[PDB]
Amino acid sequence: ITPGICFSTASLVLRATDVHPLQRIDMGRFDLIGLEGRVSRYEADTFLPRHRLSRRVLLEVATAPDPPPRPKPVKMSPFYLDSLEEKRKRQRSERLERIFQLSEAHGALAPVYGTEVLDFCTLP
């Protein structure tokens, strides 16, 4: 029994491939192989073209009050600041725009084959 080889290198070498997120683009918009076994032809072709969110719907839902509580089953301003509120509403608008853009980006790609095709073609 021998001790292992301790190979020592510069700490900067281990960060050679590392790129800060603010310096690189999202490669998930080109991820085709990641959709296999997870995304179906139904989702890409029939559902999403019909049930994509719109900015108008998102804004309406965000601005509207909370929905009424679900019924139980039955067996049958001195301290107000204008600048702070303007900042907060600008932040809310930015958040809603980000939500819309991310929801559009994360369902843009359609699978090459899809779950249905693979399941049909996969014999026991």
Partner 1 sequence: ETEIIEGEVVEIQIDRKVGKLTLKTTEMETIYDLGTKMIESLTKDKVQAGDVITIDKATGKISKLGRSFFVQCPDGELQKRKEVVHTVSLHEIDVINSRTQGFLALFSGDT
Partner 2 sequence: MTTLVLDNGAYNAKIGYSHENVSVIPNCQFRSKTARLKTFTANQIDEIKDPSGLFYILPFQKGYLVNWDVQRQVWDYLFGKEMYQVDFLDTNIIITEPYFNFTSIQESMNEILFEEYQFQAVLRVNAGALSAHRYFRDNPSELCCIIVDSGYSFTHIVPYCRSKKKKEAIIRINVGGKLLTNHLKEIISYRQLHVMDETHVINQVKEDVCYVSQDFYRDMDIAKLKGEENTVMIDYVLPDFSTIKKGFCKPREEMVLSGKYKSGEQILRLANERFAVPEILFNPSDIGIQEMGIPEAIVYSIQNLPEEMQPHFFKNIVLTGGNSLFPGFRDRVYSEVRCLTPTDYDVSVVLPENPITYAWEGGKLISENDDFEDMVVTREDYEENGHSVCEEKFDI
Partner 3 sequence: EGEVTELTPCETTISHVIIGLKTAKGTKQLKLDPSIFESLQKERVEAGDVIYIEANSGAVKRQGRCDTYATEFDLEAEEYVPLPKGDVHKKKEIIQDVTLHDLDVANARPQGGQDILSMMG
The residue ranges that bind partner 3 (CB under 8 A) are: 21-28, 30-34, 98, 102, 105
Q: Please state the length of the chain.
A: 124
Nearer to partner 1, 6 or 22 (CB): 6
Among 2, 8, 23, 63, binds partner 1 (CB under 8 A): 8
Site for partner 1 in 72-91 (CB under 8 A): none
Determine if 54 is a binding residue for partner 1 (CB under 8 A).
no
Q: How far is the CB of 75 from partner 3 (least distance, A)?
A: 26
Q: How far is the CB of 101 from partner 3 (least distance, A)?
A: 9
**In three state form, how does the secondary structure of 59-94 look?**
HHHHHCCCCCCCCCCCCCCCCCCHHHHHHHHHHHHH
Rounded Cα distance between 36 and 44, Å, is: 12
Rounded Cα distance between 50 and 118, Å, is: 24
Rounded Cα distance between 103 and 96, Å, is: 11
* Residue 79 binds: one of partner 3, partner 2, partner 1, none (C-beta under 5 to 8 A by kind): partner 2
Determine if 14 is a binding residue for partner 1 (CB under 8 A).
yes
Write the CA distances from 67 to 16, 63, 93, integer angstroms.
51, 12, 21
Among 13, 71, 79, 121, binds partner 2 (CB under 8 A): 79
Question: Which spans of this chain sit near partner 1 (rule: CB under 8 A)?
Answer: 5-10, 13-14, 16-17
